[PDB]
Design a protein around this ligand. Structure first.
Ligand SMILES: [Br-]
Lengths: 375, 368
């Protein structure tokens, strides 16, 4: 067999988000094994709990690479967990397939990024909001590197467009008391809240937000780290009318997505939903396996070379590994949450967008990463 | 902190059943930590994947006890996984809290059994079926020790009652092709199927059973290893009208269960269900913590002594650790599956039943 690692938060504040990623990866593995496996071998998943603990993510990655001798690790969600795994896969010349939207400003040669780069999510989210009258942003997120960097990007883009930030607050991951933040929002009276909270902190915020008398008609919240899965956990009654930006919705009308959702529901239950992180985790297993097949080997250097330019008929639409940076070409979509927790798409790119993690195509994003070179 | 082990199948054919037990144990741990913890320390869970693989369960139990140095392990489902963990906890003098119904005929001093003993599930299931006109049983289960031992018990009891078995078939865990079994069932024309399939084999069987044109009125299926969680995974449209026997349903009307179901849905989502193994997993964390608090130590020998007789107002009703065998006194309930996957209770005992894993109160069970 060919052993593959699965490294996700199965416990802790992030487990609301990451458990269904392990499910999506195992489904793709089961599908590939039933079709004859890879290089004549079956895939054997080694599942490890990251426990929403970034030191634990690092030690588990070291064990999977050095002890279990996996060929690849599928996992991580928070950029804190990814950046904890980054030195491990780089030092061991391992591979991490990372399925979660994030802040960009990174391009490890040992990470394949299946989630949105900022030009494929956060940046067009701001532009669409601005173009639709939202000028005064209130920034709320969790206190770690992704929301801090995301809000750094958002402020620079808002300065370019002509908008302002009238509030900025951070809470530790797993925080549950949002009355103080909500009271500040009530006083500031912003046009929109841009929400970068991650994990089950979102359960507490959106419940306390509605209980405080605020609904989506009075103050829309645009979220980038929750989707259909978390919406079902929080409760669609607390999210109806609020906004998300992703590359994929369960409601996407493609033949590929129709098959994907039925298969996911057939395996895990008719009540189960799919969303963008779930799609990216499923995509990531298929793309890695396709690179191994093309390379004729699980050797990381050979897999890295073969993965350049590989395409996939993904549920969201056509995707492709960008050889420049090991990110994915993805379609951008913005939608509003429906009463049943599904997304009604309001806007999208007419084609997949090339990933641009360092925002090289955005003239206003010059000194954001502070890193030298051509990136 | 006090490290505790969680050892369940988070991958493989058993994960349909066991992942929610990890959710239940983690919720109880969080509740206990928010009430000041245990002996002044918070509980730190170490979650390990058993991978529906009994050799993996044994190795993970060894790591949890020897390297992580946990004070207890909550986990296992299949009697194959429990019996692979059994020698590890005995050799290391560890403790396993095991929350799943099983065949009995076992009483490890290093295992606390929160799921039903056979006198608390399988045995009354047969008697109620027999007393309601089912005389010709067709037995179908997964090919390992629990369904084989359970069917041995069922055959002994049916011979005592005056019933007969007109069929008995086993499929390996994870089996998905039930056309042959269903064809044999169609030819045997049994009164009832007694289902001991475990894991996502149940998904394929019940779907193919309905698509073969067999409804619950024409042929009721009594199951002992699936409940509300698996019913939602399979789809209630295939289970509507079929039967189960447990000690708990989500629909149980007690004040404690109203609180339990509300808290479970509040943490994990309003669509999530509870069932008997989920309750037992939640029960086991609280009962272990109470034994530690009473003993004033996590030392296994002291915890074992303090646990004798400890009560708990469980969502299902009053329970208690039987000092004779470290099993739980539990109420017996039989119910039918509704259109929404919930259970309508048809019958129950008026009081919790003392656990009797060796069936010493049944003279027909002498030679097992
Ligand atoms: Br899990």
């Amino acid at each position: 067999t060919i052993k593959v690692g699965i490294l996700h938060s199965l416990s802790g504040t992030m487990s609301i988000s990451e458990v269904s990623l392990k499910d999506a990866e195992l489904m793709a593995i089961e599908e590939i094994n039933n079709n004859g496996g890879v290089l004549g071998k079956k895939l054997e998943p080694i599942v490890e709990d990251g426990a929403s603990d970034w030191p634990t993510f690092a030690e588990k990655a070291k064990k999977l690479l050095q002890k279990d001798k996996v060929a690849v690790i599928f996992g991580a969600w928070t950029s804190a967990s990814r950046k904890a795994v980054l030195p491990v896969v780089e030092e061991n010349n391992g591979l991490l397939f990372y399925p979660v939207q994030y802040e960009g400003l990174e391009s490890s040669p040992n990470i394949f990024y299946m989630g949105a780069a900022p030009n494929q999510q956060i940046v067009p989210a701001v532009k669409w909001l601005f173009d639709n009258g939202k000028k005064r942003f209130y920034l709320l997120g969790s206190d770690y590197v992704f929301p801090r960097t995301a809000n750094k990007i958002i402020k620079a883009y808002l300065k370019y467009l002509g908008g302002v930030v009238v509030g900025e607050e951070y809470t530790p991951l797993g925080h549950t008391d949002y009355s103080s933040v909500i009271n500040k929002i009530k006083a500031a009276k912003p046009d929109v809240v841009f929400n970068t909270l991650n994990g089950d902190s979102n359960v507490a915020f959106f419940k306390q937000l509605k209980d405080a008398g605020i609904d989506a008609n009075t103050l829309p919240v645009m979220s980038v780290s929750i989707a259909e899965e978390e919406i079902k956990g929080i409760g669609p009654e607390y999210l109806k009318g609020h906004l998300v930006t992703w590359n994929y919705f369960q409601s996407v009308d493609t033949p590929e997505n129709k098959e994907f959702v039925e298969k996911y529901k057939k395996k895990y239950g008719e009540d189960r939903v799919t969303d963008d992180p779930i799609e990216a985790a499923y995509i990531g297993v298929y793309l890695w396996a396709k690179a191994v097949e093309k390379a004729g080997s699980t050797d990381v250097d050979k897999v890295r070379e073969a993965a350049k330019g590989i395409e996939f008929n993904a549920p969201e639409g056509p995707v492709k590994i960008d050889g420049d940076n090991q990110h994915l070409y993805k379609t951008v979509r913005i939608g509003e949450i429906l009463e049943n927790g599904q997304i009604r798409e309001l806007w999208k790119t007419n084609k997949p967008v090339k990933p641009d993690p360092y925002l090289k195509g955005y003239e206003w994003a010059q000194g954001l990463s502070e890193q030298g070179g051509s990136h």
